[PDB]
Amino acid sequence: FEDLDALGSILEEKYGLLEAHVVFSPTPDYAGITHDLSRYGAEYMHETVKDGDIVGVSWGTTMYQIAQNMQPKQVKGVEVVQLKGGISHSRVNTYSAETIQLFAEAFQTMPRYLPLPVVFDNADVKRMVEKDRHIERIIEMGKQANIALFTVGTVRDEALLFRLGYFNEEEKALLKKQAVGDICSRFFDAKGNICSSAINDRTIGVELQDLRLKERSILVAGGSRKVSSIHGALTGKYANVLIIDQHTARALVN
Amino acid sequence: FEDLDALGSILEEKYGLLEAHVVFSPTPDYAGITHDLSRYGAEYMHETVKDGDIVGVSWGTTMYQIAQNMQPKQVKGVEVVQLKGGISHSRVNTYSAETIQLFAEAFQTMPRYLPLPVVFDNADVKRMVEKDRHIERIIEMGKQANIALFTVGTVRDEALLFRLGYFNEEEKALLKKQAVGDICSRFFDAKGNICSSAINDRTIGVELQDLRLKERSILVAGGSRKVSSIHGALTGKYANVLIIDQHTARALVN
Numbered sequence: 001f002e003d004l005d006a007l008g009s010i011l012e013e014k015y016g017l018l019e020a021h022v023v024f025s026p027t028p029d030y031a032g033i034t035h036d037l038s039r040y041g042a043e044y045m046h047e048t049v050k051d052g053d054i055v056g057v058s059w060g061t062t063m064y065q066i067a068q069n070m071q072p073k074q075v076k077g078v079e080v081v082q083l084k085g086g087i088s089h090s091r092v093n094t095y096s097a098e099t100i101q102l103f104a105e106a107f108q109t110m111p112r113y114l115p116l117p118v119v120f121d122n123a124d125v126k127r128m129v130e131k132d133r134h135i136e137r138i139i140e141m142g143k144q145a146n147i148a149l150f151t152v153g154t155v156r157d158e159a160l161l162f163r164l165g166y167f168n169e170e171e172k173a174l175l176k177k178q179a180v181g182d183i184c185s186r187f188f189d190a191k192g193n194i195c196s197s198a199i200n201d202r203t204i205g206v207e208l209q210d211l212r213l214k215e216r217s218i219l220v221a222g223g224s225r226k227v228s229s230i231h232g233a234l235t236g237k238y239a240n241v242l243i244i245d246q247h248t249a250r251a252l253v254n
Numbered sequence: 255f256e257d258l259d260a261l262g263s264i265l266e267e268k269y270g271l272l273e274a275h276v277v278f279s280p281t282p283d284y285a286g287i288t289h290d291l292s293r294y295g296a297e298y299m300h301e302t303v304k305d306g307d308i309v310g311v312s313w314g315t316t317m318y319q320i321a322q323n324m325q326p327k328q329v330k331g332v333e334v335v336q337l338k339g340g341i342s343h344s345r346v347n348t349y350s351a352e353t354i355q356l357f358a359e360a361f362q363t364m365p366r367y368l369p370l371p372v373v374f375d376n377a378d379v380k381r382m383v384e385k386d387r388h389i390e391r392i393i394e395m396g397k398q399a400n401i402a403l404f405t406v407g408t409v410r411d412e413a414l415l416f417r418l419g420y421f422n423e424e425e426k427a428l429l430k431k432q433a434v435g436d437i438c439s440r441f442f443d444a445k446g447n448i449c450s451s452a453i454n455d456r457t458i459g460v461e462l463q464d465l466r467l468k469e470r471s472i473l474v475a476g477g478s479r480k481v482s483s484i485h486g487a488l489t490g491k492y493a494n495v496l497i498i499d500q501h502t503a504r505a506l507v508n
């Protein structure tokens with residue numbers, strides 16, 4: 001038995017967080033953890049979002065589970081914006097559109113989509129694509145967002161970001177060796193530093209340093225497979241609110 | 255009363271078509287015509303598509319109605335590919351994804367999406383985007399397609415292609431004055447000639463001259479608002495199969 005409050009305050013002081021929410025999940029398996037964290041993430045969002053908020057959302061399996069658990073809230077003037085594009089160049093679907101739809105619906109608004117892949121083949125195309133005024137507006141809304149909600153990814157073989165046709169096998173091998181994970185599809189190492197300036201320069205979406213400026217940058221993540229990823233993310237100070245299970249919390253404190 | 259067979263053979267000889275299918279629609283209103291043409295289009299597709307076919311589909315209100323009326327067919331080895339991207343930069347939705355999903359489902363396959371807008375801000379970005387190998391593959395499948403299904407659009411104020419954030423007001427004014435319509439979002443005049451090489455050079459999707467090479471290039475269109483558009487399309491020889499109502503057929507013969 002962990003005093004979840006004790007673990008929370010330890011994480012808060014260790015990583016300089018505004019809030020650490022240690023959620024009880026009875027078993028250490030990833031599915032079970034994720035389910036419990038997604039549930040509390042949805043409750044936290046419902047409690048937190050208020051009139052006039054600009055809310056940035058990520059995508060992926062965690063974010064879709066949170067979305068699926070969202071319940072409506074009577075708020076006015078809320079904007080919900082996609083923080084990174086979710087277009088795939090493979091048959092694999094990110095469900096980014098469905099995820100943001102569910103969040104926007106909860107908050108009585110319509111989704112502000114970012115209708116792009118997150119990674120492009122080269123920095124020249126990225127720079128030409130990002131200059132489209134519609135894209136610029138969406139990226140600027142992502143910067144304005146006072147609330148950002150995301151997870152951290154892994155570099156496992158079946159990592160979603162390795163299945164979307166973005167990367168060649170040399171790049172995947174590099175990331176598997178040199179990154180611990182991604183936030184919004186930007187890859188960092190164990191110290192939170194950007195792994196590859198070249199790959200980062202091919203990416204359209206919220207910049208990691210911009211997350212540090214927000215009223216709430218909320219990281220929802222847990223499981224043994226994400227311990228190192230979370231540690232990197234927190235070391236980089238990319239989130240000020242952490243929603244985590246007690247197994248993973250203990251692993252980080254230890 | 256029109257002998258629909260007589261009108262058909264007249265259109266066939268007038269425009270050098272492989273097939274003209276004159277569909278009876280009792281009233282001249284656009285909704286009524288479109289419904290009847292969409293229904294027969296779905297039946298024609300069901301009858302026509304066979305094992306191994308590569309089928310290219312367009313999008314828009316006509317194409318979505320056809321899609322909604324499609325019934326399944328037990329065929330093997332069929333590919334269904336999007337002929338032009340359907341991403342919008344406004345809140346207006348083309349339903350391109352839902353349209354191709356319904357066609358692919360009918361033909362026992364999964365959609366080959368073109369995850370792009372059809373028009374880009376400038377020719378430089380278009381050229382850089384089209385070089386992505388995934389995009390190249392989809393465009394090449396569109397060229398390989400032995401069956402292409404499309405409508406022709408108008409240049410009315412509420413034309414779908416004027417509502418997607420592609421064009422500034424100067425460009426819309428130019429197109430309204432100088433084009434009669436579009437096939438797959440490429441604009442032509444009354445003689446079937448491309449209106450603007452500049453706008454055409456900003457467009458990713460099936461090239462009009464490539465439609466002329468296919469076993470079946472199927473144009474489904476009717477209504478007084480599309481008479482001039484259809485005439486331009488047929489004058490350019492972009493379709494070898496026409497599905498049209500008897501009101502519009504009479505207007506073209508007259």
Ligand SMILES: *CC[C@H](O)[C@H](O)COP(=O)(O)O
Pocket residue numbers: 058059060061062063151152153154160161182183184185
């Ligand atoms: C946007 C990509 C996510 O950061 C991550 O790689 C995948 O999310 P899940 O781990 O929740 O699938």
Ligand SMILES: *CC[C@H](O)[C@H](O)COP(=O)(O)O
Pocket residue numbers: 312313314315316317405406407408414415436437438439
């Ligand atoms: C892909 C655009 C279509 O050619 C056309 O502009 C619109 O289709 P509907 O006329 O069927 O809406």
Ligand SMILES: [Co+2]
Pocket residue numbers: 169
């Ligand atoms: Co190899």
Ligand SMILES: [Co+2]
Pocket residue numbers: 423
């Ligand atoms: Co004006």
Ligand SMILES: [Mg+2]
Pocket residue numbers: 025026032035036
């Ligand atoms: Mg549980």
Ligand SMILES: [Mg+2]
Pocket residue numbers: 279280286289290
């Ligand atoms: Mg009818």
Ligand code: NI
Pocket residue numbers: 046073
């Ligand atoms: Ni409430």
Ligand code: NI
Pocket residue numbers: 235
């Ligand atoms: Ni450390």
Ligand code: NI
Pocket residue numbers: 028246247
């Ligand atoms: Ni444990």
Ligand code: NI
Pocket residue numbers: 300327
């Ligand atoms: Ni049949």
Ligand code: NI
Pocket residue numbers: 489
């Ligand atoms: Ni003529």
Ligand code: NI
Pocket residue numbers: 282500501
């Ligand atoms: Ni009539």
